[PDB]
Amino acid sequence: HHHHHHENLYFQGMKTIVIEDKQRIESIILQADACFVGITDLEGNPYVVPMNFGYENDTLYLHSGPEGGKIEMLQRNNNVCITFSLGHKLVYQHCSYSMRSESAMCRGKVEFIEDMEEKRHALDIIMRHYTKDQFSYSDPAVRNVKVWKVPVDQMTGKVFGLRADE
Amino acid sequence: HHHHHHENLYFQGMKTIVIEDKQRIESIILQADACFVGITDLEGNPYVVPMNFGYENDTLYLHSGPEGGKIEMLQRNNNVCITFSLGHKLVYQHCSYSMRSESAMCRGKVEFIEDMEEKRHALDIIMRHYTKDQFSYSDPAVRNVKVWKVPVDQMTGKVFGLRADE
Amino acid sequence: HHHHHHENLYFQGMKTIVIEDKQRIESIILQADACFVGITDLEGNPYVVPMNFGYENDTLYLHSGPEGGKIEMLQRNNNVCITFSLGHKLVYQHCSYSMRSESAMCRGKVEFIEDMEEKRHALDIIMRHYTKDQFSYSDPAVRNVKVWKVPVDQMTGKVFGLRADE
Amino acid sequence: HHHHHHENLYFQGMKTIVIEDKQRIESIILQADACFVGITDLEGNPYVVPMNFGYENDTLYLHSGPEGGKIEMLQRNNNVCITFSLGHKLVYQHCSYSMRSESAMCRGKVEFIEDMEEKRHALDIIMRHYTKDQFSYSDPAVRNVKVWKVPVDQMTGKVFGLRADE
Amino acid sequence: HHHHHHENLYFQGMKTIVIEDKQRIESIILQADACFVGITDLEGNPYVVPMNFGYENDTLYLHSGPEGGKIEMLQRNNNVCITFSLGHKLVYQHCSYSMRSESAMCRGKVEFIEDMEEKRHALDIIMRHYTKDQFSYSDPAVRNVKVWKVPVDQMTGKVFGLRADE
Amino acid sequence: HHHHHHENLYFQGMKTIVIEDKQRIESIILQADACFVGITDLEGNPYVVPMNFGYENDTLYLHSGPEGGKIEMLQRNNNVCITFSLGHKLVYQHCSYSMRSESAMCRGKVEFIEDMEEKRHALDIIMRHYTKDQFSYSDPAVRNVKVWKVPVDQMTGKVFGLRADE
Numbered sequence A, B, C, D, E, F: 001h002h003h004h005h006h007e008n009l010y011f012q013g014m015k016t017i018v019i020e021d022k023q024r025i026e027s028i029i030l031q032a033d034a035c036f037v038g039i040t041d042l043e044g045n046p047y048v049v050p051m052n053f054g055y056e057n058d059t060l061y062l063h064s065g066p067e068g069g070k071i072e073m074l075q076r077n078n079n080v081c082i083t084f085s086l087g088h089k090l091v092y093q094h095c096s097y098s099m100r101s102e103s104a105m106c107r108g109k110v111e112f113i114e115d116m117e118e119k120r121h122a123l124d125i126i127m128r129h130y131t132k133d134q135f136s137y138s139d140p141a142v143r144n145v146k147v148w149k150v151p152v153d154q155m156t157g158k159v160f161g162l163r164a165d166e
């Protein structure tokens, strides 16, 4: 493994570019291990919490314990902004340095699924994001989890390029 | 490379544990490539934006273009929640499956640094997070960037363990 | 990195499974760095040659010098079987050992594209398989390469599982 | 990890070079996870099938179920061309781009080993290519596999270099 | 993965630089998987033996069987030089080639811990260097190992840079 | 990537095994990035210094500045013990934990090559250990380096296995 170092790089733009292609945005979502869920707290300030997730058919699924911090907040305002990003890559253009990454952002409202069988279905979507293993859930386990359904009302993607030239 | 698959895993708890050790929380921050900045939007809903950053001496530094989306929001409410996380690891206990990750969260208020030399200093903290290369910034480049200073008022860390047993 | 060794494994089946999903077969093709081109030689015996390639719209593209070995053969019989495979993965089922891989196979006939502009187009499909860089081709370079077009008449995929149990 | 991209690359030669050194060709064979077996089908056209293998003392060993597709073909013509290749490497010469790989090719005739103990011996050569684990084979397992012995009559190696310059 | 090759590199200096920062030297020690223990043999010549180790609070811990080669030597001279190094990195300065690594060196004297409980404590420091797993040690296992304690009297670090220019 | 953790492991033996096969010992040497050179210091105590190296035909080659620390020592006693090791691997036997590595050790005497052309030859052996690039050496560069030749009088290899069982 090797590195390229420069003595005389001059900082320049960053430009973001919008990703239009829905499959490409979904690809980012599907590649991500965690997501960052923004919730407005009880004082009107941001709260960002990382969480595991599943995604299918314009819908995000999460799960948590049944209380409290983020739960109290969602009960007051259930609008969430869920953001995803993969690491940056470093690209040298031939000289020129560019550090590039991409992200997805989903906005929607949180429901807590109550039906026991719907909860299992959703829990399966979440687990399938991380393993091919078969999961069972006892009734008491399904009872002691809140399963979040977030139909995605707006889904966007962005490429960010941070640039420097010699 | 190899994988372990099970036919009969039963979902169980997730538990979060609080990370008290400040150096350990800072280690997470220092390991992270990007951070997820939560801002309350103009309607009171969450907006989470990934961004590059630097961290030193209980202070986060970011930079952006001088407008608009996130800028308009910060001008109305400059409280931000900035969250960091490293990938999950998979641990098999010997049977038992555990998927474990850790995160940091910083809460503080955003200033936009106006002094040209302070802006360069801060830009250096940000760049040093990603490379050892020396960056210069022309005056016009320093002018055309907003450099965000976020003294961290509360910094917390959390380990999350998602568990299943045979 | 770690390994699991067993003292008492008993060899069992191999089973192949057919992959029906065309996008999944194309995914294998798109993941592969090289392909293995089977040509019948002048005596009726197999000749398998690895080659770089591009794939779009049920068509494979290759390129070579304008002579000789494989060229003489194709001039007598231009039917080729082009095969692709990704490495094996090792999966332990929980005990049981399974070594699993997947492959694609395309059958079609080889044309040598003569039009200079068609040759460039095809050469672009091939290069785009390996890099995002822009390639130019002088006229003399386009002249001194044979560009193979292989419309795919049959495309199949297979998963192979080699199994052992304790 | 980083990438180098160019705006103005001009495609040039590919050259193959012959690898004379037998130990070097055997090294390629020994590094490979799978091999691509070319068989002439019943209509005289190529059939290329990937397969696992072992190699010792100028002899390749494979195994399969006792029927059918490739078996019917080998019963008509047991000449096979078995080809191996490792991934390409990318080399920048300092500018100049070169994508380089190497391959081996073995030509020989297929026997199906009938003696039960010879079959086990050969199966061991194959397994030792992939693991250090001890494999047993019940009699019924040895019965229900065809074990292919292919003394190698011609073994060749080739380095291929695909080149572009600025 | 890619490589950069040059036709016309001119060998130049190597320079070592002293690492003053104790935490940085300890970081090297903590990163290392093995250490190389120098012992003067019975004829006055060097003997360098690799070994696993633990490090805490300016003290190195090792363990071995209770005899013989290195044991006889230490009984005559228990001064040891224990050296650590991480792989080299390759850095291209933009042209210029630099191959850089770092090492730590600890000098101290070896005791063999006799108290059974002290031996377990030390064995724990060693194991914690390699895994988070809980180890037990039967009395007979603790008896049949020599546990080496080496208070570090001098600890130094060095960066070595091997350089070539175009 | 995943890990296996145990609650109840019992420490056991370490056993070393002697590696007899000269090609296998040379393979370890050839795989190593650095070597650890033991020299007896001026007081009769060990000094272990890491260094780059080349190996061909039972001979090790190193290079350094023309002074001082290790040079003064070698002028009094030019016997060196040069040791090599590759990382450990972790092997789970199926339960049982084994951490395994291998090392080589070469004993010989150090000459400093004086002839300018011999020095270049040797410097080439060293560089070829790390890159395929062509190195030149001006006369003044060859003058300002000591090139060490160490015909290997004894070369040995050892596998070390550190074991724990459930």
Ligand SMILES: Cc1cc2nc3c(=O)[nH]c(=O)nc-3n(C[C@H](O)[C@H](O)[C@H](O)COP(=O)(O)OP(=O)(O)OC[C@H]3O[C@@H](n4cnc5c(N)ncnc54)[C@H](O)[C@@H]3O)c2cc1C
Binding pocket: A033, A034, A035, A049, A050, A051, A052, A053, A062, A063, A064, A065, A067, A068, A069, A070, A071, B014, B016, B085, B088, B101, B102, B103, B104, B105, B156, B157, B158, B159, B160
């Ligand atoms: C990548 C990864 C995946 C995760 N997946 C899930 C999951 O799917 N479901 C789930 O319930 N949890 C998950 N977690 C943890 C998730 O962030 C927790 O729900 C959260 O930490 C507890 O949520 P809360 O709002 O109820 O916290 P509370 O206990 O109500 O808040 C207590 C306080 O602790 C601090 N805090 C809370 N969360 C974090 C954070 N993670 N990092 C640093 N400080 C924090 C804040 O100061 C907060 O106000 C995951 C964590 C990681 C790192």
Ligand SMILES: Cc1cc2nc3c(=O)[nH]c(=O)nc-3n(C[C@H](O)[C@H](O)[C@H](O)COP(=O)(O)OP(=O)(O)OC[C@H]3O[C@@H](n4cnc5c(N)ncnc54)[C@H](O)[C@@H]3O)c2cc1C
Binding pocket: A014, A016, A085, A088, A101, A102, A103, A104, A105, A156, A157, A158, A159, A160, B033, B034, B035, B049, B050, B051, B052, B053, B062, B063, B064, B065, B067, B068, B069, B070, B071
């Ligand atoms: C890891 C990485 C690092 C980055 N580092 C920086 C940096 O340090 N400084 C910086 O200014 N930018 C950075 N970006 C991009 C940062 O997220 C942008 O500032 C943001 O995308 C534009 O911000 P804004 O609020 O001004 O967007 P606006 O242009 O005001 O918003 C337009 C709309 O586009 C969508 N959108 C905005 N951001 C995203 C997002 N990134 N993902 C998906 N959809 C989005 C939303 O629907 C938004 O309302 C980075 C991006 C990545 C992925």
Ligand SMILES: Cc1cc2nc3c(=O)[nH]c(=O)nc-3n(C[C@H](O)[C@H](O)[C@H](O)COP(=O)(O)OP(=O)(O)OC[C@H]3O[C@@H](n4cnc5c(N)ncnc54)[C@H](O)[C@@H]3O)c2cc1C
Binding pocket: C033, C034, C035, C049, C050, C051, C052, C053, C062, C063, C064, C065, C067, C068, C069, C070, C071, D014, D016, D085, D088, D101, D102, D103, D104, D105, D156, D157, D158, D159, D160
């Ligand atoms: C992965 C990789 C990618 C390649 N991509 C291309 C490409 O896209 N275009 C291209 O033209 N070539 C490519 N090659 C080389 C391709 O295999 C050559 O065209 C081939 O080696 C020469 O083809 P031929 O039939 O004209 O050989 P000839 O020179 O006519 O045959 C001479 C003899 O040498 C031996 N031989 C030929 N090919 C090989 C082989 N590769 N391995 C071992 N022995 C061999 C055989 O005994 C053969 O009969 C690639 C090679 C590798 C390893």
Ligand SMILES: Cc1cc2nc3c(=O)[nH]c(=O)nc-3n(C[C@H](O)[C@H](O)[C@H](O)COP(=O)(O)OP(=O)(O)OC[C@H]3O[C@@H](n4cnc5c(N)ncnc54)[C@H](O)[C@@H]3O)c2cc1C
Binding pocket: C014, C016, C085, C088, C101, C102, C103, C104, C105, C156, C157, C158, C159, C160, D033, D034, D035, D049, D050, D051, D052, D053, D062, D063, D064, D065, D067, D068, D069, D070, D071
């Ligand atoms: C790397 C890896 C290693 C393998 N190792 C072995 C092994 O050692 N022994 C073994 O018996 N098999 C192995 N296989 C599978 C080997 O390719 C099968 O024997 C083959 O797929 C079935 O062979 P056949 O000629 O009897 O097929 P048949 O069932 O007779 O043919 C049916 C049809 O299915 C299609 N087809 C057949 N093979 C493939 C292929 N693999 N890819 C895409 N389409 C195909 C063709 O259209 C073919 O005509 C391996 C597969 C992979 C990917």
Ligand SMILES: Cc1cc2nc3c(=O)[nH]c(=O)nc-3n(C[C@H](O)[C@H](O)[C@H](O)COP(=O)(O)OP(=O)(O)OC[C@H]3O[C@@H](n4cnc5c(N)ncnc54)[C@H](O)[C@@H]3O)c2cc1C
Binding pocket: E033, E034, E035, E049, E050, E051, E052, E053, E062, E063, E064, E065, E067, E068, E069, E070, E071, F014, F016, F085, F088, F101, F102, F103, F104, F105, F156, F157, F158, F159, F160
């Ligand atoms: C990285 C790794 C970690 C290790 N960790 C430990 C550990 O913590 N504790 C421990 O006791 N051992 C460990 N070993 C092995 C350690 O080097 C042995 O103690 C040593 O090999 C036997 O030591 P000795 O002086 O008692 O050898 P003896 O059996 O007394 O010497 C016999 C002769 O064999 C040769 N020889 C000895 N050691 C080596 C060597 N390793 N490489 C090549 N030839 C050799 C020499 O010619 C020596 O004179 C490790 C080995 C590796 C490679």
Ligand SMILES: Cc1cc2nc3c(=O)[nH]c(=O)nc-3n(C[C@H](O)[C@H](O)[C@H](O)COP(=O)(O)OP(=O)(O)OC[C@H]3O[C@@H](n4cnc5c(N)ncnc54)[C@H](O)[C@@H]3O)c2cc1C
Binding pocket: E014, E016, E085, E088, E101, E102, E103, E104, E105, E156, E157, E158, E159, E160, F033, F034, F035, F049, F050, F051, F052, F053, F062, F063, F064, F065, F067, F068, F069, F070, F071
């Ligand atoms: C893997 C790597 C490869 C190297 N390859 C070479 C090479 O081939 N040629 C070469 O000349 N040097 C090389 N070095 C450095 C080699 O170890 C130096 O020669 C050495 O550091 C200076 O040697 P000396 O005996 O002349 O030191 P001196 O300057 O005479 O000693 C000064 C003091 O500094 C300390 N010290 C010396 N060496 C080290 C060490 N490396 N680690 C920690 N403290 C130390 C000791 O306390 C020593 O007594 C390499 C270093 C690394 C890490």
Ligand code: NI
Binding pocket: A002, A004, D002, D004, E002, E004
């Ligand atoms: Ni590079």
Ligand code: NI
Binding pocket: B002, B004, C002, C004, F002, F004
């Ligand atoms: Ni494992």
